[PDB]
């Protein structure tokens, strides 16, 4: 019930760009718990502290054979994305104009 999962995630679809603002990433979990959390947080080039507002209530997951949707908010220019306890670092970049 309270778990940020210790697992490895991956995007299985190209992040859409709904101009409404949101960049909808969508990932699948390779790990063990059952209904846990996404260390979903964004940031700059180091864990340069935060530059990014997540717009997902409290996104989670239930089993291994399904995908986990996400929709976040990115003010623009140069910036980064992340997912994961470090084992299996999700260092994704994102540009915007």
């Amino acid at each position: 019930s309270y778990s940020m999962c210790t697992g490895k995630f991956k995007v299985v679809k190209e992040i859409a760009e709904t101009q409404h603002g949101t960049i909808v990433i969508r990932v699948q979990y390779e790990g063990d718990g059952s209904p846990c959390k996404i260390p979903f947080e964004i940031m700059d080039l180091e864990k340069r502290h935060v530059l990014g507002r997540l717009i997902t209530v409290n996104p989670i997951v239930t089993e291994k054979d399904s995908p986990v949707n996400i929709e976040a908010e990115p003010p623009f220019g140069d910036s980064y994305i992340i997912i994961g306890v470090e084992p299996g670092q999700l260092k994704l970049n994102w540009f915007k104009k």
Epitope: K10, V11, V12, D65, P67
Partner: antibody
């Protein structure tokens, strides 16, 4: 668990059609991408294309077009495909996959007289 | 158009040695920081099981025998503890550019 399952086998007169079928068992096809690879006697692999169930869009390897045309649907079943004005070389196996970032789980056609 | 080039069109390694395969791409294949590289393993009349993505991977729990390596589009993989299931043509892939292809691959052979 999750089982992408292609249809047994089939054969056809040269210059005809076929319609393979990749029946996914545990995930809603919509969820991701689905592929179609090709493989013959010794030849390694050649990518025939991918399809995104949700928005029907789909891109292929250029010279494979005129031939096949991938298509699964927004509804209740599996991801299909079919080649045309078939030759002899195309006489060979086909596979389907699903995961963007590494085909994790995947799924023989002959041209004769 | 795009390209990759699995050099060793074939090779054979002793039973206890270090095997190593190094793919290579035309002029580019980089996307979102990590490369969406992909590595596989296929055996006659059987289903090509997958084993790698982005050069930092695990999938379908392969007791770590086979791991990744490399990053601008110049690459190179490895399978140190070589064994029996080990005979197959590992194929080099790429999910960055849209005419997603695989490569020439390579045949493994052991030393009895």
């Amino acid at each position: 668990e999750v089982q992408l399952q292609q249809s047994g086998a089939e054969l056809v007169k040269p210059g005809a059609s076929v319609k393979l079928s990749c029946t996914a068992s545990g995930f809603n096809i919509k969820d991701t991408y689905m592929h179609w690879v090709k493989q013959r006697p010794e030849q390694g692999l050649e990518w025939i294309g991918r399809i995104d169930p949700a928005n029907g869009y789909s891109k292929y390897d250029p010279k494979f077009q005129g031939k096949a045309t991938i298509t699964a649907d927004t509804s209740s079943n599996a991801a299909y495909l079919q080649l045309s004005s078939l030759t002899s070389e195309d006489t060979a196996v086909y596979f389907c996959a699903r995961d963007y970032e590494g085909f994790a789980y995947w799924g023989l056609v002959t041209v004769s007289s | 158009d795009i390209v990759l080039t699995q050099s060793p069109a074939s090779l054979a390694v002793s039973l206890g040695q270090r095997a190593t395969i190094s793919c290579r791409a035309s002029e580019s294949v980089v996307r979102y920081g990590n490369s969406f590289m992909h590595w596989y393993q296929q055996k006659p009349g059987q289903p090509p099981k997958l084993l790698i993505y982005r050069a930092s991977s695990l999938e379908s729990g392969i007791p770590t025998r086979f791991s990744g390596s490399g990053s601008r589009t110049d690459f190179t993989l490895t399978i140190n503890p070589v064994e029996a299931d080990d005979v197959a043509t590992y194929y080099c892939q790429q999910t960055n550019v849209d005419p997603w292809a695989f490569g020439g691959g390579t045949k493994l052979e052991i030393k009895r």
